[PDB]
Amino acid sequence: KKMREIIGWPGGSGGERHFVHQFKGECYFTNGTQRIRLVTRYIYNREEYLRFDSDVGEYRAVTELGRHSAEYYNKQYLERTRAELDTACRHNYEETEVPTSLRRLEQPNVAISLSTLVCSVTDFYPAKIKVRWFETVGVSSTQLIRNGDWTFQVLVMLYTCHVEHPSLKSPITVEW
Amino acid sequence: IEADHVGFYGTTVYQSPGDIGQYTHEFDGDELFYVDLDKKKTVWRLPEFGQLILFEPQGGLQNIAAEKHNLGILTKRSNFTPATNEAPQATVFPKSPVLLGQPNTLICFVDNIFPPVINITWLRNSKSVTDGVYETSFLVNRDHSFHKLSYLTFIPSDDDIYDCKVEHWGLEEPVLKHWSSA
Ligand SMILES: *[C@@H]1O[C@H](CO)[C@@H](O)[C@H](O)[C@H]1NC(C)=O
């Protein structure tokens, strides 16, 4: 039960205000862990200057600011970094991301109301969901809304409201 | 860039002055946990996860050390190029369908935050509201900017006017997203 971190490595140098630096480790999964991709970003302020990439297989300068940086990180961290696709990505997914995120199921609360009727689907997880009215036109839904507490919500405007979400055994309906 | 699921690990953000650091993890957008740097402690967004899995806070404290280091380096290399102050975009909306008298959460979504230094405060009828207020970490964007969410626990009533006040260096005047049951 151990989630691991993607190491942001220290760089070298040579050659009063407010300044920012960011490091981003990113894993892109498909078919579970069939296809796994590891992108790494080093960012002064909002400028990504250096980047690792599974598909590339090595560090590459993104801007002039990371010009001599690519060489350095290769000479140094290319070893341990390329291996992080399994020590961090493939690991976290199969070991810590399944018993938690991928296992999280949250049932949606449905409720219709007259503002044009608004079908309110809320507090559901994951995001994958399909909703229909009982018609094709006169329909208009808001973009999927991330609440930021691991629950979503969406409001479809326009009588039964059919909702098919993974967290449910049988698609629930609400009449007006 | 397409996929099935996207986990952000080792996501670090240091900045100065003030030695302001932040380390977090995410999964398909939602924050797993941040690391309290002052108290060297992992703080999971969802406690259930903190009882199932563990993240050694040190592994995060190192990226901070690394990022603190990288900051001074790139700062000089960039020729002391200060960060530019972008204007945030606030949005207020209830967590669940509004019902008079029944407990709810009012959400203030803020986007385009940079640098990661902000003051999202709540107002009930032009009155500062301190208690029942909760924030997320600074969540990363592809912009390499940040978005943040504030939560206000409240009782929906028609005779209450709410405002989300945002104070940032990129603003000569604070944002004031108005919201009310009406
Ligand atoms: C910083 O200053 C040097 C000397 O004028 C200049 O050549 C260089 O382009 C600057 N650095 C960057 C990458 O902005």
Swiss-Prot record, chain B:
Membrane topology: Single-pass type I membrane protein
Extracellular face of the membrane: 1-179
Subcellular location: Membrane
Keywords linked to the UniProt accession: Adaptive immunity, Disulfide bond, Glycoprotein, Immunity, Membrane, MHC II, Signal, Transmembrane, Transmembrane helix
Region (Alpha-1): 1-85
Cellular component aspect of the GO annotation: external side of plasma membrane; lysosome; MHC class II protein complex; plasma membrane
GO biological process: adaptive immune response; antigen processing and presentation; antigen processing and presentation of exogenous peptide antigen via MHC class II; antigen processing and presentation of peptide antigen; positive regulation of T cell differentiation
Disulphide bridges: C108-C164
Organism: Mus musculus (Mouse)
Positions annotated as glycosylated: N119
Gene that specifies this protein: H2-Aa
Sequence ranges assigned to domain Ig-like C1-type in this UniProt record: 88-179
Protein name, per record: H-2 class II histocompatibility antigen, A-D alpha chain
Protein origin, superkingdom: Eukaryota
